[model samples]
Target: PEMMPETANIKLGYIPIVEAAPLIIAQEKGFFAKYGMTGVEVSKQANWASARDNVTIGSQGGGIDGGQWQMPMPHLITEGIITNGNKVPMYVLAQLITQGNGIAVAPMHEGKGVNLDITKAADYIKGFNKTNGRKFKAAHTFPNVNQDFWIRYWFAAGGVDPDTDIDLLAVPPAETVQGMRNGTMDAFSTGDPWPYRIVTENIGYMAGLTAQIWPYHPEEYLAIRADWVDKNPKATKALLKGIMEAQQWIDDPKNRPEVVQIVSGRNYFNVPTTILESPFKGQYTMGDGQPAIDDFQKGPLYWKDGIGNVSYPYKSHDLWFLTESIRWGFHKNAIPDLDTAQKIIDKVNREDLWREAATEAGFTADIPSSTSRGVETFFDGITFDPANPSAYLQSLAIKKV
Candidate 1:
């Protein structure tokens, strides 16, 4: 009477961050096995580039089927934009986690007035070239993705042009961390554990959290090679069931300690437990003369958040990322207009599959009523009405398009 999977084997990759906790927790807590995905492998990717290349090859070619992904990466891959036209079609099944991303500034920039409302520090950031003979420099983990979007949104909202006012580039986390330590990097946009180090080690202070920038913004996603899902449909749902269960488990405050211990182990995040402890409990020391944050809602969330479902792969959220991409001229050739973006979102966002899995797992109450989370508002009074992405773009003061 066992509902066995077509096959129990699959490879999933993740970066060492709190956003990847759902994948790690599912594997570590027997959730995968409970749903017949006994051979699930949660591997740590060296970086986003590696994750991209590996997913292109897929599990059969010594790569991954899928795991955590930044906004529009799966879309780009589907359109053969970032993948050098290889066109590795993928399906975004769930949102991995929300928030837990921050713009961290080096210690030298302390008291320069960098914070949630960066208007006060806009001039200082722009005048850096005159003062130090160099443009202000910042980095994000991956180019043209979630972290990049966050920092860009932060800078643009404050009247600073990210493209010209500051020299922004994509650098790996380790190098960026060292840059902060050496005082070469002014700021970087990244997720937890890295930000934890920046604050606790005196390397920098958190100028602002993404949670403050856009409360309950879509952060990262769970996606897989479309072909893999096509071949193992039942197994795919089983996998989602496992991840969904782990996500629910992670939301419970009582499970916080176990969550930290399991994910902080050598195979997962591989960081000291102390580095994750505070963030796990929603306690953050903002440093740089800013008040600390101790709200549980500010931390990384898996299943749900204050606004809505964190796990649902909302098409509206996908559209916003794509619209932002077009605004920045990233993959403009591939995503030329809103129509194309909507087509891509329709093809890649497999929320129907997510609903099926949720229903099968008896989590119907958690299922979102619509594919869109409706109109989204940001910290700077900007609103992104899913029905009108162009208006959202028009509202932006700084954009390439």
Candidate 2:
């Protein structure tokens, strides 16, 4: 709306996961064209590392200009690792999707005629550990990622310190299920198709959804280099508009089936229609149970605003990620203190771009009254007051940092 795209042609990258619907749908549905992007290319990366690498390269003028990614990444890119020599300045333009990851136990127990009730997942893991005489080896996408933190927070709530009670493995998203199946990993916290795949392959059962862990949780995000965005405000707004519009379409239940096919083609997920589509329709097949149930709460997860306005990038959620990163020792500061972590989050979070674009794209109505989803209460009954993150850290009994 501001002006033409200075760099009209664009190449966006993303891992081949279900939550990447915003970027994928925009490309496949001609939404980028519908907006003002003269040419749009969605490059599928093998993993988050490559996805992130390409995005970073794009920041300095490469094949990619933006991409879909994990949350609190703006801060990570600003001061965290996974970057080149200097700090790579970035902005979280918008949240692509939310609530589609889960924690699962290995098939060793489940196959041994052990359901290991997910309701008591901690006891199951703890019991399994004691009986086996080994630490539970858990898998997730990355060390400084949301899924890893979710698994950590859940384990700590269960009196399991992730740093000692278990071995946290940084398996790629595509390898999570295989890692569990081969006995290399006893459990994992990750996104769908994998969570659903973990259940369907009889490798594990769903202990809990990330949404359940932290209801309406922020799952994936869309970030761009700050320079590209500042140089091309209209292009930036156009990209966000296209993706957000695609997000609304993805949230429609009636469109779920078609959306499934759209994302499953050779260019996208290249997975089954059932595995891709079933989770959206509220069908979850936990490995512990034979019959899948209609659980609107679990499985493949949400892409749009289903409950409590999921699409917006709440800065409080960003704070939670930073605090947890500090807790687990992935933060930028020398010590895991509040003020330093807060500075990183406040400096890097750029949801203001989301506000501008959403307004132009008619998604202004969906913007919440505040950036902080205020106070978030997790599955463990611990509330994260965004204003008092220090208290949140202090409230945690088990932590390394």
Candidate 3:
């Protein structure tokens, strides 16, 4: 077979999170080069907003692609949630990883007699407010992203008001540990390694994993602008193909140890191997004198095996984000019609691109027989169905618009 032409070099953007493992693997393992690509560089962005903006404006900026983003970001851009007036259209090239985020509380709060489960994390806030007469603080990287939703959902489910019961603040991902160390934040919800590092250092303890809130929730993806996709369809396909292959390579149990080593290398996370290995192996020790092994579980961050051709944006999943946006007051009264929202989701989702890449790469997994459309019931029994998101939001006693 004739080789595909290397049309253009691709630039991938990402933060120093374990969720970005597939992209790192693709670059380090020569998967991109195997697809006749050149000049594939993974650039790190200062923050999620900076990363999103870089893709929204920078030239040859792969670090800012839409699919590589947190799910709610694209909806925020479309609904004009937090960006004031900019209507930046973003799209997902592939679902990179499913779940790997958790909440951590300061060491002082661990012994405050508050239950640490997802349900109790919020009540602990309420009780703290009543007894101590001090406002509890919770931190997340961005208000319009997944960490925000997960933290809020976990708190609300536990009977704590995310907005009023506890004060919410914006802290950069890199500074989470420092913020906790200095007593600036009582708790935080962020991606792996940070929470793991804090727990290892005896500064804070793991309160609960997001999976305990919503099991197997779609966590992150490879995101890019829609216009970029149109301009470089071939390059986009090659990029997805490379990453998809890398996902399979990383899923092997035997590769977990090496993945820890490779990702922790200086070019990547650059953290001590022991720190990286702690979360990678699912062994967690709370700083408050509690130890839990296999508290975190890793899932398909890069490849979706059952989806035929490994594509199918899962419209329902996209809709779930929209519902959460409205629930969190990010959408306000600007909620688009269901059909219109679905259309926007279709445009932003590159499932077709993924399918094309998977087929080209000779992926043999059977596609799902049925694209199940229903609410994704979280571990706490709250159902999120894209088919009736408004009703689902209303059903929750703790939810607010």
Cα-lDDT of candidate 3: 0.69
lDDT of each: 0.92, 0.73, 0.69
Lowest lDDT sum, 10 consecutive residues, model 2, at 111-120
**lDDT tens digits by residue: candidate 1, 3-41:** 578899999999989998899999999999999999999
Q: Runs in model 2 with CA error above 4 Å?
A: 1-3, 59-63, 111-130, 289-293, 297-307, 332-335
For every model shown, what is its TM-score relative to the native structure? 0.99, 0.91, 0.89
Residues 1-401, model 3: lDDT tens digits? 24464364666777788788888888888888788766677876678878767766645533344435787677666545556766767667777776667788888787654334545455667766676666787888887578888888877777788887888878876576787788767788877777777776777887777656676676777876766667777778788878877887776657777887888889887877787666666566655655575633543334543222223356677787767766776655566445655666776766667767777788735233333435578766778776677778788877655
Which is superior by TM-score, 2 or 3? 2
- Cα error, candidate 1, residue 244 (Å): 0.4
Q: How many residue pairs collide in each prediction?
A: 0, 0, 18
Candidate 1: residue 86 Cα off by (Å): 0.2
As for model 1, its CA RMSD to the true structure in angstroms is 1.0
Model 2 lDDT per residue over 83-142, tens place: 754466777777777776767877675644322223345565656668887777887776
Query: For model 1, what is the error of residue 277's alpha carbon versus the real structure, in angstroms, after optimal superposition?
Result: 0.7
TM-score between candidate 3 and the true structure: 0.89
